[PDB]
Amino acid sequence: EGREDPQLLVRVRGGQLRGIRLKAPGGPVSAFLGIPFAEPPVGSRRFMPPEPKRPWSGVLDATTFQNVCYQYVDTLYPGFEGTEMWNPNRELSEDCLYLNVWTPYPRPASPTPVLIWIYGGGFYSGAASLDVYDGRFLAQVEGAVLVSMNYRVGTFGFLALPGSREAPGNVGLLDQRLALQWVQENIAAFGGDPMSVTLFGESAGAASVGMHILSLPSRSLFHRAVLQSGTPNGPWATVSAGEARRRATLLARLVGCPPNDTELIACLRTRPAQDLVDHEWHVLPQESIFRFSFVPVVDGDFLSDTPEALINTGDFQDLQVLVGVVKDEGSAFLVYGVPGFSKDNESLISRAQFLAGVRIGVPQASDLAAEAVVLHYTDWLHPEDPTHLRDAMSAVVGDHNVVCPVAQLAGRLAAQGARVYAYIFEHRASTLTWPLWMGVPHGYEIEFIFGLPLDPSLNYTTEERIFAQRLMKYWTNFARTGDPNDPRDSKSPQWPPYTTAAQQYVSLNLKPLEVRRGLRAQTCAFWNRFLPKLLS
Amino acid sequence: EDPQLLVRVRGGQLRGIRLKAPGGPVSAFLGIPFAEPPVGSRRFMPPEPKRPWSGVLDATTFQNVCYQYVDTLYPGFEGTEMWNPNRELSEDCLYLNVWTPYPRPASPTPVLIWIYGGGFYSGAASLDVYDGRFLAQVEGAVLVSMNYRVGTFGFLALPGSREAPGNVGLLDQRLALQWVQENIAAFGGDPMSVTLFGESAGAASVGMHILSLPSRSLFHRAVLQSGTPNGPWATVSAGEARRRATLLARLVGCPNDTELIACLRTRPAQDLVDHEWHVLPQESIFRFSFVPVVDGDFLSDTPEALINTGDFQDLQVLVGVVKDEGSAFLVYGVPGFSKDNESLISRAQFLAGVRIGVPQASDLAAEAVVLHYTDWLHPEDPTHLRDAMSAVVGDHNVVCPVAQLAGRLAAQGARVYAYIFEHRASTLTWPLWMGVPHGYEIEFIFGLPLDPSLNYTTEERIFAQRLMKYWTNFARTGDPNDPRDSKSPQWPPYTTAAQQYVSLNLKPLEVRRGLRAQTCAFWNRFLPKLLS
Ligand SMILES: Nc1ccc2c(c1)c(-c1ccccc1)[n+](CCCCCCc1cn(CCNc3c4c(nc5ccccc35)CCCC4)nn1)c1cc(N)ccc21
Ligand SMILES: Nc1ccc2c(c1)c(-c1ccccc1)[n+](CCCCCCc1cn(CCNc3c4c(nc5ccccc35)CCCC4)nn1)c1cc(N)ccc21
């Protein structure tokens, strides 16, 4: 240091860091990007839990995002903003276990509440460097400290041969936990309050947040949680030890590693990263959508039991949670598998195409259950309307994978001590490039919660700017206090907790808050109470 | 002697009685024999035509009510007794009543033939609510109604036997229908324009006549109010009918078909009635011991099958339901339900009543019903659970079978008009929570509110006049709409595409779509897959 900016030099337990002074619309912020929190999980260390990062010497440059964990890059629609905005924005490498911190500039006087973001991507994709996860607006506007970490995805993160030592499973979650430990020891260097850490995340990230709520060593690492369009319970976020075993073994076969677990994992470790990616979809048991090959396994360790059992019997008094869904959870999933669906036409389907989709949307379902789904979603006045069928198929996927799982997470949590706040996000970005029929797709609240509309250069409407400010007040009010409502405010409609008695939740859109009752109450009774029994 | 009151039917001469109706005199011919009394050796057998008589037969009063169980759940209560026999009980009961205008119509008039209900165990054409005078006087109709055997006497079957072949109560009705063809002309009635109408078990009978080829040449149009030949209660199979008869016979100490039937014939009628309730296979409501049987004769195949494959092109049908088909049945065996309180039930009591209301339901199937009918916002609210139990019973037994029948007839070329009846009679003595219970549209169709001595409101007098117009317009032309009155709005036909039906209430007609579609899809399409 000679002439460096005094506000950008900070020490953490691993050594010295140099951050960068970033411009936000309303002023500067400090970012420390690419801070290593683990030893690169490379070589003999692929599939293994992560080890703490060994201290370095000199000043580590933390001015730019680090590598993205090895993943499948989407190619369904080349050039298309709608998919590319989720694609990796840095080089892919197994050396990817880094985290990012944004804090006010100058760093705040007294300790600030900390928000830790966990990206989604079905446990097979995503990076904390994506433009929609930019911590600068929350940091600058709400005075918050914001952290996001990379964690291994796909085979690299979740390939398990359960009961073995060399590939125990759940190591992606263990990267996330390591980063939470890192925040406990280090966040105070940045002015963050380690005693007020809220986890938030979306899709698979939300599932992860809930898995930290259900895993005891994670509990002392955070104090509150927000789950956006995802849950640990439900059909896609976990697998039995058996199923994960079948998958690893199948993948092994596929890459030339025939099966003892040591021989097998070793052979997999000699395989090139890309080979594993190039083969990971092939191990899924059925033609299906909203199913991912390598996901958290119920190992009897990180997850002592299935998320369903753990939410049915855990005590949560104790715990404050904000949960919700977007209007159209299913729609955008339809174009990755259901015949008849495309982003480039209005996706009007036949009744045949619907029955056919239901079997892919609900792959575990017998003929009888498939009929039950179809019968429940048919509009009997117009059982042939292409437009209604299209919307039903979207609803089936949304309801089965997100809405109804969230619906019970909120149900069981509230009944067992938790203060729960629930929402449905109903605003379609004016700037969306997916077709109008898709409505408000899975993923499209994120840019509003992070404050992107406030970037004048991004072409959001004025209404949208104000809407994002509101939502940022909601999230950080929740982080700061466990109540998304503003104490200094006077109704200005209140966000009431979700209870089992009242089942209250709010609409999030451009209009002031509207309180509604019951998240798809009838329809979720179908998925959560009836359907299970049509497997039993 | 009044020449108007003298008629020559094929069996000989009759004397009727001139009755007083609000707006003018009507001629009535009550208690006309149409069959040989089905007594002694004729018990359980097809009726035979009545033998000619000498002189002038006195047809001025109602005849005996066919032998049946008499209700005593609430002795003295108008709400139950109004359905009870209002004449002496006898196996000698095959008589019919005719009302016509006075004077006898100048030209041939449309004929309505009423078939009463009462679960094939009860009923009589003589009940005040089936009084044909108002329709006769006001709409100029010729209205006929017949007694038919009920319970063991009408429906005890040992299928395949010569002696007790089953469905004889149906054959009674058919004999009455044949009697109308041969004789009604003499009363100024038009035999080429006969409309059958009937409610509850009466409705299923009409349904059965639609589905039986010999009955088809005896009428031209049909009205089924709150009942259908398909559904869980209106038919039994040959195997099950035989089981019940056999069991009943055992129960009265009757030890080969011929032998068994001979002994049953030697039995006082009240013995058979004493033991009829005891042959039902389960604790249940809306199931009746002795009902028509799928015989391969009168019914060539199950109604479900018959409606499925039949050709119903030139056929006009009027079908409908009341708002609260299920409520009144709940007090007849579902724990927690009483007429003398608001009947608010617990969830446990709901699951329990579902097993009684849907006696065939497996553990999983009942939970399906329970899960579909719960208010998930509500979901332990006693008012709801009570209403839902009423809804389960109505839907399962009437509404959804109606919806199913309306659907197949329309699809197969019939012309269908449908309604839901939503007005609760002001005179009703059943509790408010029962709403508009099974059976309580009849007084309106028959025009009873027009009798000022009955204390109906003025609104009701006007309402009943409208219904009388709908039904008799329907009888005259196959279309219930007033064919010279403009602005209405019009009662549109039921079609499978649009599914249009109307509400009959104090307000002017309102057209709705789907009766009552999500729920009937449940009953008609899902539940059956949960049996097989
Ligand atoms: N031919 C191949 C080869 C390999 C794979 C294939 C296909 C596919 C696939 C592509 C098109 C059609 C069918 C199948 N896939 C993709 C199937 C699953 C894709 C789901 C895409 C999706 C759609 N949405 C909703 C819309 N919003 C998002 C997305 C995406 N990511 C995110 C991340 C967080 C929140 C939202 C969001 C990415 C894509 C587009 C929209 N989320 N995720 C692969 C997947 C693997 N794990 C491994 C290999 C391959
Ligand atoms: N211990 C015994 C012995 C014999 C019988 C018993 C009980 C009962 C019974 C009474 C009370 C509670 C449980 C059982 N029952 C009664 C079971 C059948 C009761 C049906 C009641 C009912 C209710 N509704 C709806 C309301 N409106 C009506 C009625 C009644 N009839 C009609 C006829 C046409 C249209 C409407 C209508 C008669 C009763 C009350 C209301 N219709 N029918 C008997 C029946 C048999 N088939 C044979 C024997 C006996």
Side-chain angles (χ1 to χ4, degrees), chain A residues 72 74 76 82-83 86 120-121 124 202 280-281 332-333 336-337 434 442-444:
Chain A
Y72 168 74
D74 197 82
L76 183 62
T83 55
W86 305 108
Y124 77 89
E202 184 273 351
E280 73 169 313
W281 211 73
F333 283 97
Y336 288 90
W434 292 102
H442 191 69
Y444 292 85

PDB file of all heavy atoms in Angstrom, chain A residues 72 74 76 82-83 86 120-121 124 202 280-281 332-333 336-337 434 442-444, ligand 1:
ATOM      1  N   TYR A  72     -23.286 -27.614 -16.482  1.00  0.00           N
ATOM      2  CA  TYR A  72     -23.921 -27.659 -17.780  1.00  0.00           C
ATOM      3  C   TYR A  72     -24.334 -26.253 -18.214  1.00  0.00           C
ATOM      4  O   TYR A  72     -25.054 -25.585 -17.509  1.00  0.00           O
ATOM      5  CB  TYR A  72     -25.131 -28.601 -17.738  1.00  0.00           C
ATOM      6  CG  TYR A  72     -26.017 -28.491 -18.963  1.00  0.00           C
ATOM      7  CD1 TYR A  72     -25.625 -29.031 -20.191  1.00  0.00           C
ATOM      8  CD2 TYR A  72     -27.235 -27.831 -18.900  1.00  0.00           C
ATOM      9  CE1 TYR A  72     -26.437 -28.921 -21.310  1.00  0.00           C
ATOM     10  CE2 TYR A  72     -28.055 -27.722 -20.005  1.00  0.00           C
ATOM     11  CZ  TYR A  72     -27.651 -28.261 -21.205  1.00  0.00           C
ATOM     12  OH  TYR A  72     -28.473 -28.131 -22.305  1.00  0.00           O
ATOM     13  N   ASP A  74     -26.555 -23.958 -20.601  1.00  0.00           N
ATOM     14  CA  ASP A  74     -27.798 -24.069 -21.383  1.00  0.00           C
ATOM     15  C   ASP A  74     -27.642 -23.704 -22.859  1.00  0.00           C
ATOM     16  O   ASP A  74     -27.044 -22.680 -23.203  1.00  0.00           O
ATOM     17  CB  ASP A  74     -28.923 -23.227 -20.770  1.00  0.00           C
ATOM     18  CG  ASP A  74     -30.301 -23.634 -21.285  1.00  0.00           C
ATOM     19  OD1 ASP A  74     -30.856 -24.625 -20.753  1.00  0.00           O
ATOM     20  OD2 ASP A  74     -30.823 -22.977 -22.224  1.00  0.00           O
ATOM     21  N   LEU A  76     -30.571 -24.757 -25.188  1.00  0.00           N
ATOM     22  CA  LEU A  76     -31.909 -24.857 -25.794  1.00  0.00           C
ATOM     23  C   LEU A  76     -32.224 -23.681 -26.749  1.00  0.00           C
ATOM     24  O   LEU A  76     -32.806 -23.905 -27.811  1.00  0.00           O
ATOM     25  CB  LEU A  76     -33.010 -25.024 -24.725  1.00  0.00           C
ATOM     26  CG  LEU A  76     -34.465 -25.221 -25.223  1.00  0.00           C
ATOM     27  CD1 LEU A  76     -34.674 -26.497 -26.077  1.00  0.00           C
ATOM     28  CD2 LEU A  76     -35.501 -25.166 -24.102  1.00  0.00           C
ATOM     29  N   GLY A  82     -33.167 -14.827 -22.290  1.00  0.00           N
ATOM     30  CA  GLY A  82     -33.970 -15.498 -21.283  1.00  0.00           C
ATOM     31  C   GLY A  82     -33.301 -16.689 -20.632  1.00  0.00           C
ATOM     32  O   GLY A  82     -33.616 -17.048 -19.493  1.00  0.00           O
ATOM     33  N   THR A  83     -32.377 -17.309 -21.356  1.00  0.00           N
ATOM     34  CA  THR A  83     -31.631 -18.425 -20.806  1.00  0.00           C
ATOM     35  C   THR A  83     -30.209 -18.001 -20.452  1.00  0.00           C
ATOM     36  O   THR A  83     -29.693 -18.341 -19.379  1.00  0.00           O
ATOM     37  CB  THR A  83     -31.608 -19.618 -21.755  1.00  0.00           C
ATOM     38  OG1 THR A  83     -31.098 -19.212 -23.020  1.00  0.00           O
ATOM     39  CG2 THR A  83     -32.999 -20.153 -21.942  1.00  0.00           C
ATOM     40  N   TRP A  86     -28.936 -16.746 -17.027  1.00  0.00           N
ATOM     41  CA  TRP A  86     -28.720 -17.722 -15.963  1.00  0.00           C
ATOM     42  C   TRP A  86     -27.427 -18.492 -16.188  1.00  0.00           C
ATOM     43  O   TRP A  86     -26.921 -19.116 -15.268  1.00  0.00           O
ATOM     44  CB  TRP A  86     -29.920 -18.687 -15.840  1.00  0.00           C
ATOM     45  CG  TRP A  86     -31.211 -17.988 -15.651  1.00  0.00           C
ATOM     46  CD1 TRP A  86     -32.207 -17.859 -16.564  1.00  0.00           C
ATOM     47  CD2 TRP A  86     -31.637 -17.266 -14.491  1.00  0.00           C
ATOM     48  NE1 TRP A  86     -33.245 -17.107 -16.048  1.00  0.00           N
ATOM     49  CE2 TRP A  86     -32.912 -16.721 -14.780  1.00  0.00           C
ATOM     50  CE3 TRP A  86     -31.067 -17.028 -13.233  1.00  0.00           C
ATOM     51  CZ2 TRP A  86     -33.622 -15.958 -13.863  1.00  0.00           C
ATOM     52  CZ3 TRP A  86     -31.773 -16.263 -12.324  1.00  0.00           C
ATOM     53  CH2 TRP A  86     -33.040 -15.742 -12.642  1.00  0.00           C
ATOM     54  N   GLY A 120     -29.946 -20.505  -6.823  1.00  0.00           N
ATOM     55  CA  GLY A 120     -30.591 -21.705  -7.354  1.00  0.00           C
ATOM     56  C   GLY A 120     -29.953 -22.135  -8.659  1.00  0.00           C
ATOM     57  O   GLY A 120     -28.881 -21.660  -9.027  1.00  0.00           O
ATOM     58  N   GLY A 121     -30.637 -23.025  -9.369  1.00  0.00           N
ATOM     59  CA  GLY A 121     -30.114 -23.699 -10.567  1.00  0.00           C
ATOM     60  C   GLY A 121     -30.252 -25.213 -10.474  1.00  0.00           C
ATOM     61  O   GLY A 121     -29.429 -25.938 -11.031  1.00  0.00           O
ATOM     62  N   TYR A 124     -27.632 -28.115 -10.163  1.00  0.00           N
ATOM     63  CA  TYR A 124     -26.771 -28.466 -11.284  1.00  0.00           C
ATOM     64  C   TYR A 124     -26.128 -27.230 -11.894  1.00  0.00           C
ATOM     65  O   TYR A 124     -25.335 -27.347 -12.830  1.00  0.00           O
ATOM     66  CB  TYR A 124     -27.537 -29.273 -12.370  1.00  0.00           C
ATOM     67  CG  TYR A 124     -28.445 -28.432 -13.241  1.00  0.00           C
ATOM     68  CD1 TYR A 124     -27.969 -27.842 -14.408  1.00  0.00           C
ATOM     69  CD2 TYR A 124     -29.768 -28.205 -12.880  1.00  0.00           C
ATOM     70  CE1 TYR A 124     -28.784 -27.057 -15.200  1.00  0.00           C
ATOM     71  CE2 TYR A 124     -30.601 -27.414 -13.658  1.00  0.00           C
ATOM     72  CZ  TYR A 124     -30.108 -26.837 -14.827  1.00  0.00           C
ATOM     73  OH  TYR A 124     -30.924 -26.032 -15.614  1.00  0.00           O
ATOM     74  N   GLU A 202     -33.148 -18.842  -3.679  1.00  0.00           N
ATOM     75  CA  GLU A 202     -34.288 -19.104  -4.541  1.00  0.00           C
ATOM     76  C   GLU A 202     -34.146 -20.451  -5.241  1.00  0.00           C
ATOM     77  O   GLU A 202     -33.031 -20.890  -5.520  1.00  0.00           O
ATOM     78  CB  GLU A 202     -34.485 -17.939  -5.514  1.00  0.00           C
ATOM     79  CG  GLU A 202     -35.706 -18.028  -6.425  1.00  0.00           C
ATOM     80  CD  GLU A 202     -35.433 -18.794  -7.707  1.00  0.00           C
ATOM     81  OE1 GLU A 202     -34.251 -19.114  -7.965  1.00  0.00           O
ATOM     82  OE2 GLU A 202     -36.395 -19.059  -8.466  1.00  0.00           O
ATOM     83  N   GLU A 280     -24.332 -36.245 -17.182  1.00  0.00           N
ATOM     84  CA  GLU A 280     -25.170 -36.194 -15.994  1.00  0.00           C
ATOM     85  C   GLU A 280     -26.691 -36.294 -16.226  1.00  0.00           C
ATOM     86  O   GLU A 280     -27.393 -36.809 -15.367  1.00  0.00           O
ATOM     87  CB  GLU A 280     -24.804 -35.026 -15.081  1.00  0.00           C
ATOM     88  CG  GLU A 280     -25.214 -33.664 -15.568  1.00  0.00           C
ATOM     89  CD  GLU A 280     -25.048 -32.607 -14.505  1.00  0.00           C
ATOM     90  OE1 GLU A 280     -25.476 -32.824 -13.349  1.00  0.00           O
ATOM     91  OE2 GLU A 280     -24.493 -31.546 -14.817  1.00  0.00           O
ATOM     92  N   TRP A 281     -27.208 -35.849 -17.370  1.00  0.00           N
ATOM     93  CA  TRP A 281     -28.646 -35.988 -17.582  1.00  0.00           C
ATOM     94  C   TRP A 281     -29.064 -37.430 -17.812  1.00  0.00           C
ATOM     95  O   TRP A 281     -30.205 -37.788 -17.536  1.00  0.00           O
ATOM     96  CB  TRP A 281     -29.194 -35.105 -18.700  1.00  0.00           C
ATOM     97  CG  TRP A 281     -30.638 -34.693 -18.425  1.00  0.00           C
ATOM     98  CD1 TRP A 281     -31.055 -33.779 -17.491  1.00  0.00           C
ATOM     99  CD2 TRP A 281     -31.844 -35.186 -19.066  1.00  0.00           C
ATOM    100  NE1 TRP A 281     -32.435 -33.662 -17.518  1.00  0.00           N
ATOM    101  CE2 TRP A 281     -32.942 -34.510 -18.471  1.00  0.00           C
ATOM    102  CE3 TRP A 281     -32.098 -36.118 -20.077  1.00  0.00           C
ATOM    103  CZ2 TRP A 281     -34.269 -34.742 -18.854  1.00  0.00           C
ATOM    104  CZ3 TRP A 281     -33.417 -36.349 -20.452  1.00  0.00           C
ATOM    105  CH2 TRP A 281     -34.485 -35.662 -19.840  1.00  0.00           C
ATOM    106  N   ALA A 332     -42.158 -21.906 -17.484  1.00  0.00           N
ATOM    107  CA  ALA A 332     -40.868 -21.957 -18.161  1.00  0.00           C
ATOM    108  C   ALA A 332     -40.190 -23.328 -18.132  1.00  0.00           C
ATOM    109  O   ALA A 332     -39.222 -23.548 -18.872  1.00  0.00           O
ATOM    110  CB  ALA A 332     -39.943 -20.898 -17.609  1.00  0.00           C
ATOM    111  N   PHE A 333     -40.683 -24.245 -17.300  1.00  0.00           N
ATOM    112  CA  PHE A 333     -40.146 -25.606 -17.279  1.00  0.00           C
ATOM    113  C   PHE A 333     -40.697 -26.479 -18.398  1.00  0.00           C
ATOM    114  O   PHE A 333     -40.091 -27.495 -18.774  1.00  0.00           O
ATOM    115  CB  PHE A 333     -40.412 -26.268 -15.943  1.00  0.00           C
ATOM    116  CG  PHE A 333     -39.494 -25.802 -14.857  1.00  0.00           C
ATOM    117  CD1 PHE A 333     -39.899 -24.811 -13.970  1.00  0.00           C
ATOM    118  CD2 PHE A 333     -38.217 -26.339 -14.734  1.00  0.00           C
ATOM    119  CE1 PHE A 333     -39.059 -24.367 -12.976  1.00  0.00           C
ATOM    120  CE2 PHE A 333     -37.370 -25.908 -13.739  1.00  0.00           C
ATOM    121  CZ  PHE A 333     -37.792 -24.923 -12.850  1.00  0.00           C
ATOM    122  N   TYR A 336     -38.648 -27.455 -21.633  1.00  0.00           N
ATOM    123  CA  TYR A 336     -37.484 -28.332 -21.455  1.00  0.00           C
ATOM    124  C   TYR A 336     -37.883 -29.810 -21.375  1.00  0.00           C
ATOM    125  O   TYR A 336     -37.313 -30.573 -20.582  1.00  0.00           O
ATOM    126  CB  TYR A 336     -36.695 -27.916 -20.206  1.00  0.00           C
ATOM    127  CG  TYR A 336     -35.947 -26.636 -20.403  1.00  0.00           C
ATOM    128  CD1 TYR A 336     -36.524 -25.415 -20.100  1.00  0.00           C
ATOM    129  CD2 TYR A 336     -34.664 -26.650 -20.918  1.00  0.00           C
ATOM    130  CE1 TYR A 336     -35.845 -24.239 -20.300  1.00  0.00           C
ATOM    131  CE2 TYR A 336     -33.974 -25.488 -21.134  1.00  0.00           C
ATOM    132  CZ  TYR A 336     -34.569 -24.280 -20.828  1.00  0.00           C
ATOM    133  OH  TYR A 336     -33.859 -23.119 -21.051  1.00  0.00           O
ATOM    134  N   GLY A 337     -38.860 -30.212 -22.192  1.00  0.00           N
ATOM    135  CA  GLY A 337     -39.358 -31.575 -22.134  1.00  0.00           C
ATOM    136  C   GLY A 337     -40.779 -31.896 -22.569  1.00  0.00           C
ATOM    137  O   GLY A 337     -40.998 -32.941 -23.176  1.00  0.00           O
ATOM    138  N   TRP A 434     -39.068 -13.976 -22.178  1.00  0.00           N
ATOM    139  CA  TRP A 434     -39.886 -15.169 -22.336  1.00  0.00           C
ATOM    140  C   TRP A 434     -41.256 -14.682 -22.764  1.00  0.00           C
ATOM    141  O   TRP A 434     -41.613 -13.537 -22.481  1.00  0.00           O
ATOM    142  CB  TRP A 434     -40.005 -15.922 -21.027  1.00  0.00           C
ATOM    143  CG  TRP A 434     -38.732 -16.540 -20.558  1.00  0.00           C
ATOM    144  CD1 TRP A 434     -37.913 -16.070 -19.582  1.00  0.00           C
ATOM    145  CD2 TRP A 434     -38.144 -17.757 -21.023  1.00  0.00           C
ATOM    146  NE1 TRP A 434     -36.838 -16.909 -19.410  1.00  0.00           N
ATOM    147  CE2 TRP A 434     -36.951 -17.952 -20.285  1.00  0.00           C
ATOM    148  CE3 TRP A 434     -38.499 -18.696 -21.999  1.00  0.00           C
ATOM    149  CZ2 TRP A 434     -36.104 -19.057 -20.489  1.00  0.00           C
ATOM    150  CZ3 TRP A 434     -37.658 -19.795 -22.210  1.00  0.00           C
ATOM    151  CH2 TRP A 434     -36.473 -19.967 -21.448  1.00  0.00           C
ATOM    152  N   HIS A 442     -40.745 -18.811 -12.730  1.00  0.00           N
ATOM    153  CA  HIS A 442     -39.766 -19.197 -11.734  1.00  0.00           C
ATOM    154  C   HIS A 442     -38.488 -18.427 -12.026  1.00  0.00           C
ATOM    155  O   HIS A 442     -37.934 -18.514 -13.129  1.00  0.00           O
ATOM    156  CB  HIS A 442     -39.538 -20.701 -11.926  1.00  0.00           C
ATOM    157  CG  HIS A 442     -38.764 -21.382 -10.841  1.00  0.00           C
ATOM    158  ND1 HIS A 442     -39.263 -21.575  -9.572  1.00  0.00           N
ATOM    159  CD2 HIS A 442     -37.558 -22.006 -10.870  1.00  0.00           C
ATOM    160  CE1 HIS A 442     -38.382 -22.253  -8.853  1.00  0.00           C
ATOM    161  NE2 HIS A 442     -37.343 -22.541  -9.620  1.00  0.00           N
ATOM    162  N   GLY A 443     -38.031 -17.669 -11.033  1.00  0.00           N
ATOM    163  CA  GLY A 443     -36.787 -16.908 -11.133  1.00  0.00           C
ATOM    164  C   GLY A 443     -36.958 -15.399 -11.266  1.00  0.00           C
ATOM    165  O   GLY A 443     -36.022 -14.643 -11.003  1.00  0.00           O
ATOM    166  N   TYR A 444     -38.142 -14.935 -11.656  1.00  0.00           N
ATOM    167  CA  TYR A 444     -38.259 -13.529 -12.064  1.00  0.00           C
ATOM    168  C   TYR A 444     -38.712 -12.532 -10.994  1.00  0.00           C
ATOM    169  O   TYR A 444     -39.027 -11.381 -11.306  1.00  0.00           O
ATOM    170  CB  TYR A 444     -38.953 -13.386 -13.434  1.00  0.00           C
ATOM    171  CG  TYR A 444     -38.040 -13.947 -14.511  1.00  0.00           C
ATOM    172  CD1 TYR A 444     -38.037 -15.311 -14.809  1.00  0.00           C
ATOM    173  CD2 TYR A 444     -37.114 -13.139 -15.167  1.00  0.00           C
ATOM    174  CE1 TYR A 444     -37.171 -15.840 -15.757  1.00  0.00           C
ATOM    175  CE2 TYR A 444     -36.247 -13.669 -16.135  1.00  0.00           C
ATOM    176  CZ  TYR A 444     -36.284 -15.019 -16.417  1.00  0.00           C
ATOM    177  OH  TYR A 444     -35.413 -15.559 -17.349  1.00  0.00           O
TER     178      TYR A 444
HETATM  179  N1  LIG C   1     -29.638 -32.557 -25.154  1.00  0.00           N
HETATM  180  C1  LIG C   1     -29.380 -32.369 -23.802  1.00  0.00           C
HETATM  181  C2  LIG C   1     -28.139 -32.712 -23.164  1.00  0.00           C
HETATM  182  C3  LIG C   1     -27.968 -32.481 -21.808  1.00  0.00           C
HETATM  183  C4  LIG C   1     -28.983 -31.906 -20.953  1.00  0.00           C
HETATM  184  C5  LIG C   1     -30.215 -31.548 -21.603  1.00  0.00           C
HETATM  185  C6  LIG C   1     -30.371 -31.816 -23.013  1.00  0.00           C
HETATM  186  C7  LIG C   1     -31.178 -30.708 -20.956  1.00  0.00           C
HETATM  187  C8  LIG C   1     -32.424 -30.385 -21.758  1.00  0.00           C
HETATM  188  C9  LIG C   1     -32.417 -29.242 -22.596  1.00  0.00           C
HETATM  189  C10 LIG C   1     -33.546 -28.936 -23.369  1.00  0.00           C
HETATM  190  C11 LIG C   1     -34.675 -29.773 -23.307  1.00  0.00           C
HETATM  191  C12 LIG C   1     -34.687 -30.920 -22.490  1.00  0.00           C
HETATM  192  C13 LIG C   1     -33.562 -31.230 -21.718  1.00  0.00           C
HETATM  193  N2  LIG C   1     -30.929 -30.278 -19.683  1.00  0.00           N
HETATM  194  C14 LIG C   1     -31.924 -29.386 -19.012  1.00  0.00           C
HETATM  195  C15 LIG C   1     -33.147 -29.951 -18.270  1.00  0.00           C
HETATM  196  C16 LIG C   1     -33.518 -29.105 -17.039  1.00  0.00           C
HETATM  197  C17 LIG C   1     -33.545 -27.617 -17.365  1.00  0.00           C
HETATM  198  C18 LIG C   1     -34.381 -26.747 -16.428  1.00  0.00           C
HETATM  199  C19 LIG C   1     -34.311 -25.298 -16.912  1.00  0.00           C
HETATM  200  C20 LIG C   1     -34.982 -24.327 -15.995  1.00  0.00           C
HETATM  201  C21 LIG C   1     -36.066 -23.517 -16.290  1.00  0.00           C
HETATM  202  N3  LIG C   1     -36.255 -22.831 -15.147  1.00  0.00           N
HETATM  203  C22 LIG C   1     -37.325 -21.821 -15.036  1.00  0.00           C
HETATM  204  C23 LIG C   1     -36.979 -20.454 -15.688  1.00  0.00           C
HETATM  205  N4  LIG C   1     -35.927 -19.693 -14.971  1.00  0.00           N
HETATM  206  C24 LIG C   1     -34.632 -20.195 -14.891  1.00  0.00           C
HETATM  207  C25 LIG C   1     -33.937 -20.793 -15.975  1.00  0.00           C
HETATM  208  C26 LIG C   1     -32.634 -21.354 -15.751  1.00  0.00           C
HETATM  209  N5  LIG C   1     -31.987 -21.248 -14.570  1.00  0.00           N
HETATM  210  C27 LIG C   1     -32.623 -20.648 -13.524  1.00  0.00           C
HETATM  211  C28 LIG C   1     -31.926 -20.648 -12.239  1.00  0.00           C
HETATM  212  C29 LIG C   1     -32.550 -20.148 -11.119  1.00  0.00           C
HETATM  213  C30 LIG C   1     -33.885 -19.615 -11.214  1.00  0.00           C
HETATM  214  C31 LIG C   1     -34.569 -19.595 -12.423  1.00  0.00           C
HETATM  215  C32 LIG C   1     -33.962 -20.113 -13.632  1.00  0.00           C
HETATM  216  C33 LIG C   1     -31.895 -21.910 -16.853  1.00  0.00           C
HETATM  217  C34 LIG C   1     -32.506 -22.063 -18.078  1.00  0.00           C
HETATM  218  C35 LIG C   1     -33.652 -21.244 -18.361  1.00  0.00           C
HETATM  219  C36 LIG C   1     -34.399 -20.717 -17.345  1.00  0.00           C
HETATM  220  N6  LIG C   1     -35.359 -23.217 -14.257  1.00  0.00           N
HETATM  221  N7  LIG C   1     -34.567 -24.129 -14.752  1.00  0.00           N
HETATM  222  C37 LIG C   1     -29.755 -30.613 -18.937  1.00  0.00           C
HETATM  223  C38 LIG C   1     -29.729 -30.571 -17.499  1.00  0.00           C
HETATM  224  C39 LIG C   1     -28.753 -31.211 -16.727  1.00  0.00           C
HETATM  225  N8  LIG C   1     -28.772 -31.138 -15.348  1.00  0.00           N
HETATM  226  C40 LIG C   1     -27.742 -31.952 -17.380  1.00  0.00           C
HETATM  227  C41 LIG C   1     -27.736 -32.027 -18.749  1.00  0.00           C
HETATM  228  C42 LIG C   1     -28.734 -31.415 -19.591  1.00  0.00           C
END
